[model samples]
Target: TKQRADIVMSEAEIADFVNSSRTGTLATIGPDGQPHLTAMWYAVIDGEIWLETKAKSQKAVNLRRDPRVSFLLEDGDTYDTLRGVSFEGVAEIVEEPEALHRVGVSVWERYTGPYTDECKPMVDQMMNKRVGVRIVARRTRSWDHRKLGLPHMSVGGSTA
Candidate 1:
């Protein structure tokens, strides 16, 4: 039996971790059957992972043909501090104006400040250039190595 189950994050923990994160590495299959990885800013909408990208981007082109995708969200530096969540899923490309607008609002609010009427103009422009991808996870895995009880080095210069 695997002894490291202690490091696995709970469902609630996974959701919290993903929400607290900024960018995730999204892997989509390229036309040549290779992985096309890109760092993407995403939003968790109604418990689903959503990412917006230029409609004509390579990854977008790949997803149009094959929906299979993988996403990795992680944090930390050293071995003891390493923590991450990864998942394999199918992407549903969203082109509907309302859905795209909602995603744009969420992403902007997460990365910037609260969504106000002032933000509407900028967000509107994004709607025409982008498409949103909603991921439905087939499998997910997470690890928080801090559970291992290992010593970690502090990069910030304050001595404890």
Candidate 2:
């Protein structure tokens, strides 16, 4: 039998989970040849994951040198409730003014609330110092342990 195949999420399920999740862990290769991980706020625009960060941030520096990245979105209180999506992709930096503003606005709205004119000045300021990183996922994997219909303690994998 296929091991753990039943826990795999379908495309639509993966999309829905990602669209609903607020925070994702982003992995970028550091200059020291180690993975630098950061918690990011993201928005999915046109089916691509986008996030904004300070132009001089370490993660941004990492991406400029190596486009490869891995992203994870996960949630759970207990093992039986665990669910997650992992992405492997190449990152593209968004520096064009309009594109950066679009991503910045989307991320703001996703976390806080509506993006109104009152928010323009703040977003405009972000446009000056922040650049957007878009994850162009080449491969994706997802799992929902709840689908197992059994306690995770009964599973064979190593504990976290």
Candidate 3:
């Protein structure tokens, strides 16, 4: 019974989901041998997921100990249509100041406002207090029920 053999999303579809503006639930392995989940604001830039968070946060600590991590982004409220993308990747410090600056600017512009020159110094200062994580996805799974060809009555789209 290949029930869900036909609902898989294409690479383009998955990319679109990850590129969209969305909050993803990031999963990490905790020190106590438990799965820790954090709803985080994320941006997928250049096909990579980047997260900015407190340097000493639990999520950061967990990732340092274990690079393995996962993220899920989904959309759709009703059953007629639903879409989601889940990916597993290893977390790493972006390392490049320019890359980090770009992602941080993009993130700030998204949640706050323009990253003006006047505001950049202040924002950059704050960014130093935060650590940036880049997730290099090694595996991914995607689904878009639109392939199911049901009634198609619901307004739905997906994002990451």
Candidate 4:
């Protein structure tokens, strides 16, 4: 049997999923006509997805060449019940200290739980050495079996 479903989730549910996931795959189009996807630590704040990458990394270079990118964060469990969020948008390189600082703090909080003195130096290093890329979330999507009525929905129900 084959099946598929596509539906837009409510804004609150989308926000909740973004807030809960810490890591996501940042996908960019490379100059060589290939998709470059990298696992990255990220934070969703103020309706934008923010992350940092080494200035010399391939993903960074790809973004400079083409800002169109897609970020995906998903649960690794069963596909039928999987929950995830994807952000499709153009990425902007952030160099302003205030914006960078805000995103830095948020990213640190997401990865390290709570900020501590011990983590300050690491955060500082990341802020200094990496480039900040903020995805302004032009479009967002979320999916979860529970939201669609699991088990039954997973099989079939609201179909033609």
What candidate 3 gets wrong by more than 4 Å, as runs, is 1-5, 153-160
Candidate achieving higher lDDT, 1 or 4: 1
| Candidate number that wins on lDDT, 3 or 4 | 3
Index of the highest-lDDT prediction: 1
**lDDT at position 18, candidate 1:** 88
Q: Report the C-alpha lDDT of model 2 over 50-88, residue by residue, as the tens digit.
A: 988889989899999999999999998678888998998
The RMSD (Cα, Å) of candidate 3 is 4.5
Sequence-dependent TM-score of model 1: 0.90
Query: How many residue pairs collide in each prediction?
Result: 0, 0, 0, 0
User: What TM-score fits each model?
Assistant: 0.90, 0.87, 0.85, 0.80
* Alpha-carbon shift of residue 26 in model 2 (angstroms): 0.7
Tens digits of per-residue lDDT for model 3, 1-160: 1225688887787787777746889999999879999898875677778998777999889998988999888888667578887888899965477776777787877677777888888668767877789888878777787887788675447732
Candidate 1, residues 50-131, lDDT tens digits: the string is 9988899898899999999999999987678889989998999999988998898888888987999888889999777889
Residue 118, model 4, lDDT: 82
What lDDT does candidate 1 reach at residue 43?
73
TM-score of decoy 4: 0.80
lDDT of 3: 0.80
Worst 10 residues of 4 by lDDT: 151-160
**Overall local distance difference test of candidate 2:** 0.87
